[PDB]
Amino acid sequence: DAARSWSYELEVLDVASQSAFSIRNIRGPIFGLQRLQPDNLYQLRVRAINVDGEPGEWTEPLAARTWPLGPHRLRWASRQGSVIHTNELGEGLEVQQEQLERLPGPMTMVNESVGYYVTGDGLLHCINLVHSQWGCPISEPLQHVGSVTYDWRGGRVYWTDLARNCVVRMDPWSGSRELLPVFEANFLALDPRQGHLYYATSSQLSRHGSTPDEAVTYYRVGSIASFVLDTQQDQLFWLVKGSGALRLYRAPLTSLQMIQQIKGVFQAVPDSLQLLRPLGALLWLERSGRRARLVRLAAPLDVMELPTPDQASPASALQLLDPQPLPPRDEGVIPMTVLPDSVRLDDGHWDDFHVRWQPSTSGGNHSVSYRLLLEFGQRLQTLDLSTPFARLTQLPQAQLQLKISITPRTAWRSGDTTRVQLTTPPVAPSQ
Amino acid sequence: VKNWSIRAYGRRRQQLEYTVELEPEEVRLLQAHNYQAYPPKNCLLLPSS
Amino acid sequence: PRRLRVFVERLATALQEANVSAVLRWDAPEQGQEAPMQALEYHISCWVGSELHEELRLNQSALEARVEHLQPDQTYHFQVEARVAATGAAAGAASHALHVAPEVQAVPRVLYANAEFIGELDLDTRNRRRLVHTASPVEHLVGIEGEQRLLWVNEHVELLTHVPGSAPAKLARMRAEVLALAVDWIQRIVYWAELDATAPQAAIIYRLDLCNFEGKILQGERVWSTPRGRLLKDLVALPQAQSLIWLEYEQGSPRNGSLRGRNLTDGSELEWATVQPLIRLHAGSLEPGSETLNLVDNQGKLCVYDVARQLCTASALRAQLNLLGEDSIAGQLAQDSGYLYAVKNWSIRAYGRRRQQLEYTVELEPEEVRLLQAHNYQAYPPKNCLLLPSSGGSLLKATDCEEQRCLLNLPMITASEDCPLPIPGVRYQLNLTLAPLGQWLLGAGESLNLTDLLPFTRYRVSGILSSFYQKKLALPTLVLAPLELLTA
Amino acid sequence: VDERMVLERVTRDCVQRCIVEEDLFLDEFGIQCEKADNGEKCYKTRCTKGCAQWYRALKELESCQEACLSLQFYPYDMPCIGACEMAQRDYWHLQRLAISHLVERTQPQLERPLTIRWAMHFPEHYLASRPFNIQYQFVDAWFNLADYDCDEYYVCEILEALIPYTQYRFRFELPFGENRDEVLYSPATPAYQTPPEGAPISAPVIEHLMGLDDSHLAVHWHPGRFTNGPIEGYRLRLSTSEQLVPAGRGSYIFSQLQAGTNYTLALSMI
Ligand SMILES: *[C@@H]1O[C@H](CO[C@@H]2O[C@@H](C)[C@@H](O)[C@@H](O)[C@@H]2O)[C@@H](O[C@@H]2O[C@H](CO)[C@@H](O)[C@H](O)[C@H]2NC(C)=O)[C@H](O)[C@H]1NC(C)=O
Ligand SMILES: *[C@@H]1O[C@H](CO)[C@@H](O[C@@H]2O[C@H](CO)[C@@H](O)[C@H](O)[C@H]2NC(C)=O)[C@H](O)[C@H]1NC(C)=O
Ligand SMILES: *[C@@H]1O[C@H](CO)[C@@H](O)[C@H](O)[C@H]1NC(C)=O
Ligand SMILES: *[C@@H]1O[C@H](CO)[C@@H](O)[C@H](O)[C@H]1NC(C)=O
Ligand SMILES: *[C@@H]1O[C@H](CO)[C@@H](O)[C@H](O)[C@H]1NC(C)=O
Ligand SMILES: *[C@@H]1O[C@H](CO)[C@@H](O)[C@H](O)[C@H]1NC(C)=O
Ligand SMILES: *[C@@H]1O[C@H](CO)[C@@H](O)[C@H](O)[C@H]1NC(C)=O
Ligand SMILES: *[C@@H]1O[C@H](CO)[C@@H](O)[C@H](O)[C@H]1NC(C)=O
Ligand SMILES: *[C@@H]1O[C@H](CO)[C@@H](O)[C@H](O)[C@H]1NC(C)=O
Ligand SMILES: *[C@@H]1O[C@H](CO)[C@@H](O)[C@H](O)[C@H]1NC(C)=O
């Protein structure tokens, strides 16, 4: 019942102009300050005036730097499946018409209608946000899915299948799935410039490319909580959830160093790290769902705290929505189909028995590699080639009908299979 | 390279060893993995004195 | 039923990285007398969290394994399953999780030296060895565990060495009664103290460098001596503090033990403050930054001393060792990195440093143990500090000259600013030239005083610098800066 | 007899899944087999090879990439590896659902070296699983115990130097295979207090330290977490005045000090 009815002082110290601007007579500890210049840094201290006019001391200045100017929208998701679009304060709430499932994760957007998200039980769901009667190629939800990502350039949806320990690449327009040889991965991000798939296990974080020379391991350990990929600045952040210490790192895509270790019993949601683009900031949602933590890359020691709105009171996902639209599917990375008339089995002298075809090209001139299948009756021979050339070693000599299947591929996707049947030439010497 | 075929002549036995036929626009340049003999590790690195 | 016994063993060899291995020992299950001795297949899987570290399958009668390349401050889980080899039947299974922590963990092995031999007594398996059969009985015993070298003094007062695979070689023959013995393990210097029979009695500290030992008998060098009327006991060399701690008592008062010593670089006398007079001094942790002495007060009370803080340190092993009595902890007291050994009533009692408890009590024959030496962890410098330096520099400083001679000073060498300790076994080879006139192969620490020089004539010295480890590794010799020395 | 039903149920579900999803995945060579070939190029033959090789890889500690190694489809036979990994996670899910009630109904017992006796047994494929962790908790989160030694009947022996005069609760974490979400937790033990030994390792944290007037100075404090024994006294050094205050009092007020100047309080715990 002791009374401390005080009026507080909040100063604004701009570092760009060296100007001290101070207001008076605020009654509560909460204050909503308005009318700041964007893309600017400020220093803030607080003291408190009593009834008699004697103020308290200054505090330490906090490095407070503004969000840049723009319609900068945050997409909140509940644990009950409601989607609320706020701006960067947690104000300006718009309740979206879509209804997600229980405990949804980060929604990965394919075009402006169709998105893919992974719930808390491991199921992967598709939702058409605009017209829900059509747009999803997979009819039922798919179990044991770790995360999901999308390549805009290849036009392929990538998810980690936790049951198979594989990464499944899917066409969003047809639902055709491909097993990729990426093992024990939990989270995915693909670089669209070069086609490299970056993946993080529970133990390690590494890279998968179109050749085995392009596999670079960046980290080896607690466990990796999430990771994001910075395509523009050529760098790579991840969250390691250890023994009571949430620690974030940075490595280039080609110095591995520690940015901030957050100590406490509270930790982050797996797949909740996000790169905020206009600050160069890193966000993660907390496990209790009532708090989103933000660190700036310029100032590592300042860890900002974003409270969650009351309408979505436990949160399970938060994205900064990109203000540009997503770019469409590139037809410059699609490999052209190998012509079936150009697949010859023109042989040389001695033991040079080989199959040549016209080389498949793409629109933008990318490296087209080939996978070839042979059928000598029951005999099978599979070759992974980088040239339009395949030497036949085990030729059975007895004038067979050979079935040849050329599949062109790039680093982003694969072309259509060309299936031909060719009569083998007569082989007189056998030595 | 003679008449769309690359002919390897062995240095030890002094004979023609391999003749591999080519497509007519496969070879414009020809470079071999010749043995690039390196100095020892005292010569390549920083000196002592 | 017997349990699986895993021990963390850290072994450091000079010019090599310190490796950490787990010694896994498990006895066989109980078999009947009708069946013979059965081969047991031991499947050992070692895990670090959720990843597999090493996987071992061994056919043995009883388990004796080593899992190499463990990392310090890391939790390793050893999943060991035992199956009978001929039938496939499961004999047993064990799961041992182990924080590594190598400053407080070792294998319980001591070195004992009776009148007949020097042997190893493992206190886990209770098995006795013989390292060297001595013709004359051992009085003092120290060791260098990086090269398995035992240095000892017999009754015929002679200093001998023993590498495994060779005969005992005499390093020195000594003409007085030896009070104590110690070794600098980094610089390979063996320090001992000899009695003086002058009626004020003192103890003269001798030294001998093991890098000058080429197979013939060397002689010791007097470097320090005691103030007269006082005597030495219990020489302990600390290399990382560069100290040589003894116990200096007075003749006629052996229970007035005071801790003194010298600094090993400049020879300055160092003093250590104790709250009570002493009787005997034993070495402790031998770890850089945390060096320890196990010193005994005159009441039969152990103090776990700290060298850097110059004060007593309270431990839970201090109360348990004081219950053994004065004759046990001042009889023989040994301490490795993991255990702390004492002999009471013909039984050697290992007290563990990590759990602060009595761990092993092994009964003895009444004349088995006269001395007790533990394999304490001799921490070595890195390979930049032990070897030859990179830059030559102006190491020889020119002194003030007379007309006849110039006293050239020959100092010790640290390899860089990151290396605090001197380079072991430094030998200069020098010639003198008139700006050869002389040829000297002289070590570091002494002086070359250079007689028969012409007056008002400049002279020039030149030198190469040779160390012990650069001759062993066949590394090339540094040529230092040829400096010119003027005579007036 | 329950284990062979679990084996045959996982093998039945594996061959039934490889019958079902044979049209679902586009292969890298463009295979597109029909429903009745039984040829080596197709999804169904490589996938039933994966359901043939899942148990032999588990009991001999082989990976599914190393078990499903072929010279036709190299370096990775993805239906074979996928069917092996799906059958191994279905097997460890069925063992966890089999033994879940027996894990969560059986309480470990502490006796006193410190010994936990749990009334269970090691699994049949013990080396194929992850290592079990004993977990500790202060009574007044669960952290993993670093040093223990257990045999096959779970008669464990804690070799970790615990904090003296600290109430502890212990439980068993059982992982099942390499899946990190498939862990079973045992119930906690009855709470055991360590016997008291040694000096305290935690300084007592003050609550409020201010002056009363120009001639008095007040302090309030609470005891620390690891007090290492029965608490007897708190020594207060003001810089000097050094007083002895017993264990019941947590507030002391100094006197006869100088007006208007800057001091330093040192508080210890005895
Ligand atoms: C460990 O030993 C087993 C069994 O050893 C066999 O039985 C003993 C009594 C003795 O007579 C041995 O010489 C026998 O080999 C080994 O299992 C055998 O392994 C070989 C080689 O792979 C195989 O041909 C045999 O069939 C196996 N025999 C049996 C009975 O299982 C096993 O390999 C040994 N392990 C290691 C790591 O050496
Ligand atoms: C976004 O892409 C999806 C496909 O991923 C489109 O959905 C198709 O829409 C047409 C027209 O409504 C339907 O006939 C198809 O059946 C849908 N495809 C599938 C696979 O179901 C969708 O129209 C696209 N949205 C926009 C705005 O372009
Ligand atoms: C690709 O190659 C063609 C033919 O060589 C050329 O005309 C074209 O400029 C190249 N680039 C793109 C982006 O299409
Ligand atoms: C040279 O090449 C042509 C290519 O058509 C071929 O017909 C001819 O036989 C070759 N000549 C010789 C001598 O091999
Ligand atoms: C470990 O160190 C010892 C002593 O230096 C040596 O004999 C042994 O070969 C080492 N073992 C390794 C590196 O596996
Ligand atoms: C023990 O020695 C110290 C230091 O020499 C001296 O002051 C002291 O008197 C001695 N005590 C006795 C009882 O002789
Ligand atoms: C010994 O002398 C060296 C060099 O003067 C100095 O660095 C060191 O501190 C001294 N050691 C002790 C223990 O005083
Ligand atoms: C001490 O040793 C003797 C040896 O005969 C033995 O009888 C005696 O029991 C021992 N005392 C204790 C207390 O163990
Ligand atoms: C060497 O000269 C020094 C100068 O101090 C002198 O002490 C010493 O006696 C000389 N030694 C000899 C052997 O002449
Ligand atoms: C000293 O001179 C002799 C004779 O030329 C030569 O063998 C030796 O290497 C020289 N040593 C130095 C250190 O210059």
Side-chain angles (χ1 to χ4, degrees), chain A residues 1-3 5-133 135-348 352-431, chain B, chain C residues 1-33 35-36 38-396 398 401 406 408-432 435-450 455 457 459-485 487-488, chain D residues 1-177 179 182-270:
Chain A
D1 296 332
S5 178
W6 292 352
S7 53
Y8 310 101
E9 283 312 280
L10 183 65
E11 63 90 20
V12 170
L13 190 147
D14 204 358
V15 68
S17 53
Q18 194 63 255
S19 299
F21 167 69
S22 292
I23 69 153
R24 288 180 174 89
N25 293 1
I26 191 66
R27 195 172 181 177
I30 193 66
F31 178 56
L33 188 153
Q34 297 256 19
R35 304 172 181 180
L36 283 172
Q37 296 293 317
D39 216 348
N40 202 13
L41 170 59
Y42 303 93
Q43 271 86 1
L44 302 175
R45 303 171 290 177
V46 63
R47 55 169 63 236
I49 310 178
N50 52 9
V51 183
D52 278 3
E54 296 306 303
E57 322 165 359
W58 288 128
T59 60
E60 52 264 15
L62 174 69
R65 204 221 191 271
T66 46
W67 261 89
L69 162 63
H72 280 174
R73 274 171 320 111
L74 280 167
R75 181 194 153 275
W76 291 90
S78 311
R79 289 194 190 168
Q80 270 78 60
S82 76
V83 180
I84 297 169
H85 287 178
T86 73
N87 64 296
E88 52 279 28
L89 277 297
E91 302 157 349
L93 282 78
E94 165 157 310
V95 176
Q96 306 294 134
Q97 303 264 350
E98 57 257 16
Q99 195 65 46
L100 303 189
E101 301 273 347
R102 184 176 176 87
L103 280 150
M107 162 96 78
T108 311
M109 202 65 68
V110 173
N111 45 3
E112 52 273 60
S113 298
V114 176
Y116 283 80
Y117 64 100
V118 173
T119 58
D121 45 352
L123 274 71
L124 170 81
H125 300 257
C126 171
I127 171 169
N128 198 298
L129 269 77
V130 177
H131 38 275
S132 176
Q133 83 281 337
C136 290
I138 311 296
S139 61
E140 286 188 1
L142 294 174
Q143 323 185 348
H144 313 113
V145 175
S147 80
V148 67
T149 188
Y150 178 64
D151 193 14
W152 63 267
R153 199 161 171 187
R156 289 297 183 263
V157 163
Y158 294 83
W159 67 79
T160 47
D161 211 292
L162 293 181
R164 302 188 176 87
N165 283 320
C166 83
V167 161
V168 179
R169 161 164 78 193
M170 194 208 58
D171 206 7
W173 289 276
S174 67
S176 67
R177 283 177 247 177
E178 308 151 45
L179 302 178
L180 293 196
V182 173
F183 301 103
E184 301 146 40
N186 291 114
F187 309 105
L188 293 168
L190 188 147
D191 199 9
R193 306 169 307 178
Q194 72 214 9
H196 291 165
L197 182 72
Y198 291 84
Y199 63 100
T201 79
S202 179
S203 175
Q204 78 176 28
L205 186 134
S206 61
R207 183 169 86 184
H208 179 250
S210 53
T211 51
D213 296 327
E214 297 163 17
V216 176
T217 302
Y218 300 101
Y219 194 59
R220 253 161 290 181
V221 306
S223 62
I224 300 178
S226 185
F227 89 110
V228 298
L229 167 80
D230 201 7
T231 66
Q232 276 152 29
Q233 298 276 110
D234 274 31
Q235 64 183 357
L236 187 61
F237 319 102
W238 59 94
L239 270 186
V240 174
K241 182 193 303 306
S243 172
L246 190 74
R247 36 201 289 171
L248 188 153
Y249 294 72
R250 187 212 81 97
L253 290 195
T254 77
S255 51
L256 163 72
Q257 93 283 349
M258 252 305 307
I259 297 170
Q260 202 74 320
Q261 181 177 7
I262 297 297
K263 293 184 178 172
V265 74
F266 40 86
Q267 273 155 349
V269 181
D271 206 354
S272 61
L273 189 58
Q274 206 202 7
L275 178 63
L276 311 163
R277 180 64 65 193
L279 280 74
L282 283 155
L283 183 145
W284 60 92
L285 204 64
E286 300 277 80
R287 154 141 51 81
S288 312
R290 288 170 289 268
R291 175 154 91 242
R293 307 282 297 271
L294 283 78
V295 65
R296 281 196 320 109
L297 285 163
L301 299 174
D302 187 33
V303 189
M304 311 166 38
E305 178 179 358
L306 173 56
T308 305
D310 194 37
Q311 279 80 13
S313 290
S316 70
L318 164 78
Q319 271 154 39
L320 176 71
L321 296 176
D322 186 74
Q324 281 91 51
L326 209 61
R329 199 263 307 274
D330 209 323
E331 302 256 349
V333 306
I334 306 180
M336 262 194 56
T337 300
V338 173
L339 300 180
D341 300 343
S342 73
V343 190
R344 55 204 174 262
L345 201 156
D346 274 348
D347 52 351
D352 203 2
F353 286 119
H354 60 259
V355 172
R356 289 187 192 265
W357 54 96
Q358 179 170 325
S360 173
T361 46
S362 55
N365 302 298
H366 298 295
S367 304
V368 175
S369 307
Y370 315 97
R371 285 209 219 262
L372 177 137
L373 178 82
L374 293 179
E375 271 275 89
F376 284 120
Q378 174 164 170
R379 271 199 37 93
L380 203 77
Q381 185 179 352
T382 78
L383 319 173
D384 190 19
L385 311 156
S386 60
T387 44
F389 186 79
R391 182 176 180 268
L392 320 180
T393 61
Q394 284 282 305
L395 207 45
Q397 152 171 353
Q399 198 92 340
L400 282 72
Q401 300 292 314
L402 173 58
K403 282 165 289 179
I404 309 167
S405 301
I406 298 90
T407 318
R409 74 188 192 272
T410 44
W412 294 270
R413 48 156 292 172
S414 297
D416 288 332
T417 314
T418 295
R419 293 175 189 88
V420 287
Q421 208 153 2
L422 294 185
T423 310
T424 45
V427 190
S430 190
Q431 188 274 331
Chain B
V1 180
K2 162 83 176 176
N3 202 40
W4 295 321
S5 80
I6 171 169
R7 285 172 167 86
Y9 289 92
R11 290 187 42 192
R12 181 181 65 85
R13 274 215 291 174
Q14 313 272 349
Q15 264 170 33
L16 171 66
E17 311 258 18
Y18 296 99
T19 293
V20 171
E21 293 265 329
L22 306 164
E23 203 206 20
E25 311 275 358
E26 269 192 355
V27 173
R28 286 179 56 252
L29 300 168
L30 210 62
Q31 211 262 332
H33 312 266
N34 215 336
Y35 180 63
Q36 302 190 332
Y38 274 130
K41 204 168 172 165
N42 290 318
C43 302
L44 289 170
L45 269 170
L46 214 62
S48 186
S49 302
Chain C
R2 274 95 150 188
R3 313 273 297 233
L4 169 71
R5 315 175 307 265
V6 194
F7 307 100
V8 168
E9 197 189 9
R10 185 174 40 172
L11 293 179
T13 293
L15 310 174
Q16 274 184 2
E17 69 275 16
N19 74 6
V20 176
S21 47
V23 185
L24 278 80
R25 292 175 186 160
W26 194 6
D27 291 331
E30 211 275 338
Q31 301 173 1
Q33 88 167 45
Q38 293 252 30
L40 298 152
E41 181 158 14
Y42 287 99
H43 203 313
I44 304 159
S45 300
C46 171
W47 297 74
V48 182
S50 177
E51 54 199 292
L52 191 63
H53 185 262
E54 293 207 357
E55 167 164 318
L56 279 75
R57 275 182 211 78
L58 295 161
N59 267 293
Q60 275 166 351
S61 53
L63 182 56
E64 197 158 65
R66 178 166 307 259
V67 177
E68 284 102 359
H69 303 140
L70 302 203
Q71 296 278 346
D73 291 331
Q74 205 148 342
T75 301
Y76 284 70
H77 276 70
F78 301 98
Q79 315 291 117
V80 182
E81 204 188 31
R83 290 181 181 270
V84 191
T87 70
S95 178
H96 195 99
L98 188 65
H99 200 43
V100 166
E103 299 95 15
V104 292
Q105 277 180 180
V107 186
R109 287 189 292 243
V110 296
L111 287 162
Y112 64 98
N114 62 6
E116 302 156 18
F117 61 97
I118 304 178
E120 210 173 24
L121 170 51
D122 193 9
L123 300 187
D124 180 46
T125 51
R126 290 173 174 86
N127 262 321
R128 287 147 174 84
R129 277 172 44 192
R130 178 218 281 131
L131 276 76
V132 54
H133 175 88
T134 57
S136 57
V138 190
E139 296 272 333
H140 314 274
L141 168 75
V142 290
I144 307 180
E145 280 86 30
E147 63 184 1
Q148 288 165 335
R149 165 178 315 271
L150 298 187
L151 309 158
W152 79 92
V153 171
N154 313 305
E155 278 200 355
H156 303 286
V157 182
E158 291 172 355
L159 180 72
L160 278 71
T161 187
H162 182 259
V163 192
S166 81
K170 304 185 186 183
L171 307 157
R173 295 176 179 174
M174 294 181 286
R175 274 141 281 280
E177 191 205 80
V178 159
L179 304 183
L181 181 77
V183 62
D184 199 337
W185 65 83
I186 297 169
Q187 270 86 47
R188 293 167 40 91
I189 314 179
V190 186
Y191 299 94
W192 67 89
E194 295 185 26
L195 193 72
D196 210 55
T198 300
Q201 302 203 359
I204 297 90
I205 297 90
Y206 285 82
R207 70 178 182 179
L208 184 136
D209 204 278
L210 292 180
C211 315
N212 309 350
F213 182 67
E214 321 274 350
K216 274 82 71 183
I217 298 177
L218 268 76
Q219 290 181 357
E221 183 178 1
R222 301 172 86 259
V223 291
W224 301 290
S225 62
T226 301
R228 290 279 160 178
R230 310 198 77 191
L231 288 184
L232 260 53
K233 201 188 289 185
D234 277 299
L235 199 62
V236 171
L238 293 176
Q240 278 92 16
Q242 298 143 355
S243 298
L244 185 74
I245 297 171
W246 56 78
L247 190 139
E248 192 166 296
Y249 68 98
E250 271 208 59
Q251 183 193 6
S253 291
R255 304 182 90 56
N256 212 308
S258 66
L259 216 58
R260 305 282 161 231
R262 310 298 216 250
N263 190 358
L264 288 176
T265 52
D266 48 348
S268 73
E269 316 192 5
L270 294 174
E271 262 159 20
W272 278 269
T274 61
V275 296
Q276 210 171 6
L278 301 177
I279 42 171
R280 273 190 46 82
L281 169 77
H282 312 99
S285 291
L286 294 189
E287 199 83 27
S290 307
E291 283 167 347
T292 304
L293 298 165
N294 285 334
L295 54 82
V296 185
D297 299 331
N298 62 6
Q299 293 179 356
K301 298 298 158 183
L302 183 63
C303 181
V304 193
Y305 208 71
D306 203 355
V307 187
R309 302 193 302 114
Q310 272 203 59
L311 284 171
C312 274
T313 300
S315 294
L317 279 191
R318 186 169 44 86
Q320 316 170 18
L321 275 161
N322 282 351
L323 285 166
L324 301 192
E326 199 190 65
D327 303 1
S328 175
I329 52 155
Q332 285 304 302
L333 197 73
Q335 181 186 355
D336 65 23
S337 67
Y339 292 90
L340 162 53
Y341 313 99
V343 181
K344 161 84 176 176
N345 202 32
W346 299 317
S347 79
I348 171 168
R349 285 172 166 86
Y351 287 91
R353 291 186 42 192
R354 182 179 63 85
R355 274 220 312 280
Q356 315 269 20
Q357 269 184 348
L358 173 66
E359 310 258 18
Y360 296 100
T361 293
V362 171
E363 283 265 329
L364 307 162
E365 203 206 20
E367 311 275 359
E368 269 191 355
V369 172
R370 280 214 302 116
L371 300 168
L372 211 62
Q373 174 89 0
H375 312 266
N376 215 338
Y377 180 63
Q378 302 190 332
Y380 274 128
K383 205 169 172 166
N384 290 318
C385 302
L386 288 170
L387 270 167
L388 214 62
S390 187
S391 303
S394 186
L395 297 165
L396 293 156
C401 285
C406 297
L408 183 64
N409 206 355
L410 283 69
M412 311 285 198
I413 297 93
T414 72
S416 59
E417 56 179 359
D418 314 315
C419 296
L421 311 168
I423 294 168
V426 165
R427 259 159 162 182
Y428 300 135
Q429 157 67 63
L430 293 172
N431 322 298
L432 167 72
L437 300 171
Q439 280 188 329
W440 309 276
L441 182 50
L442 215 61
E446 62 266 42
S447 183
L448 192 43
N449 65 329
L450 294 172
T457 316
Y459 281 85
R460 170 216 307 161
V461 290
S462 81
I464 60 166
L465 191 153
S466 55
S467 302
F468 175 63
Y469 288 126
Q470 70 103 27
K471 293 192 289 290
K472 187 183 273 324
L473 269 186
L475 197 144
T477 308
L478 187 151
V479 183
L480 60 85
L483 188 153
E484 284 93 8
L485 192 41
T487 77
Chain D
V1 64
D2 182 40
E3 177 89 4
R4 316 188 191 182
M5 294 298 103
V6 159
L7 267 290
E8 284 147 33
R9 182 184 171 186
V10 165
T11 300
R12 273 162 225 163
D13 290 351
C14 201
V15 178
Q16 189 55 252
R17 282 177 294 178
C18 296
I19 282 173
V20 167
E21 53 173 10
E22 57 182 0
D23 204 85
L24 183 62
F25 290 104
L26 183 63
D27 201 357
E28 58 204 349
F29 303 102
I31 296 287
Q32 54 165 15
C33 275
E34 51 166 20
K35 285 97 193 173
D37 276 350
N38 194 328
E40 311 274 9
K41 40 182 288 194
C42 315
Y43 195 94
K44 199 176 66 179
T45 317
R46 289 146 73 193
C47 198
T48 43
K49 186 188 168 160
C51 308
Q53 293 293 330
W54 69 270
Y55 189 49
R56 191 206 56 81
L58 194 140
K59 78 200 182 195
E60 293 179 353
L61 281 73
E62 274 160 41
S63 196
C64 290
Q65 316 175 20
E66 313 298 320
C68 275
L69 186 66
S70 64
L71 301 163
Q72 311 154 26
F73 299 99
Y74 50 91
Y76 299 114
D77 195 12
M78 291 313 296
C80 205
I81 292 172
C84 181
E85 288 289 326
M86 280 185 108
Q88 279 187 358
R89 280 140 181 65
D90 282 13
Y91 170 71
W92 290 122
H93 188 69
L94 284 193
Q95 302 284 120
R96 189 197 78 105
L97 287 185
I99 209 168
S100 194
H101 299 277
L102 183 63
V103 163
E104 276 138 11
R105 93 198 189 192
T106 300
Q107 193 182 27
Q109 303 294 324
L110 276 156
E111 66 185 5
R112 194 181 210 151
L114 190 64
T115 289
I116 306 171
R117 292 185 71 98
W118 200 21
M120 291 265 298
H121 196 64
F122 275 4
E124 186 170 335
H125 310 306
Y126 156 71
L127 282 154
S129 297
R130 283 182 292 173
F132 72 102
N133 292 357
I134 309 179
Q135 294 194 325
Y136 71 98
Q137 178 189 64
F138 310 102
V139 188
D140 42 18
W142 290 91
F143 313 102
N144 288 324
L145 211 67
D147 287 272
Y148 53 90
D149 178 61
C150 309
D151 60 299
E152 40 173 6
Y153 307 101
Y154 283 100
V155 177
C156 297
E157 183 178 1
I158 296 93
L159 315 172
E160 181 180 346
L162 302 169
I163 307 297
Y165 197 76
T166 305
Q167 293 224 300
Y168 275 110
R169 271 204 315 170
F170 294 98
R171 85 167 169 194
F172 286 88
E173 166 181 1
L174 294 175
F176 286 89
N179 185 327
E182 269 174 65
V183 288
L184 279 181
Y185 294 140
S186 79
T189 54
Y192 154 81
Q193 163 154 270
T194 318
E197 192 57 353
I201 58 171
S202 51
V205 189
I206 50 168
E207 301 180 338
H208 294 88
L209 180 49
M210 59 182 184
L212 289 183
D213 60 329
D214 47 351
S215 46
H216 304 92
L217 180 83
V219 62
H220 295 252
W221 70 96
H222 59 86
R225 190 177 184 179
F226 320 102
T227 183
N228 264 276
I231 180 66
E232 311 295 30
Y234 321 97
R235 274 211 300 91
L236 297 93
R237 331 174 201 178
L238 188 56
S239 54
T240 65
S241 169
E242 179 170 319
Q243 310 278 346
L244 266 293
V245 160
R249 304 191 32 110
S251 57
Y252 201 55
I253 294 92
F254 286 92
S255 292
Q256 275 96 27
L257 72 163
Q258 283 79 243
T261 183
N262 174 259
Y263 293 10
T264 298
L265 183 64
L267 176 68
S268 283
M269 198 170 184
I270 284 183

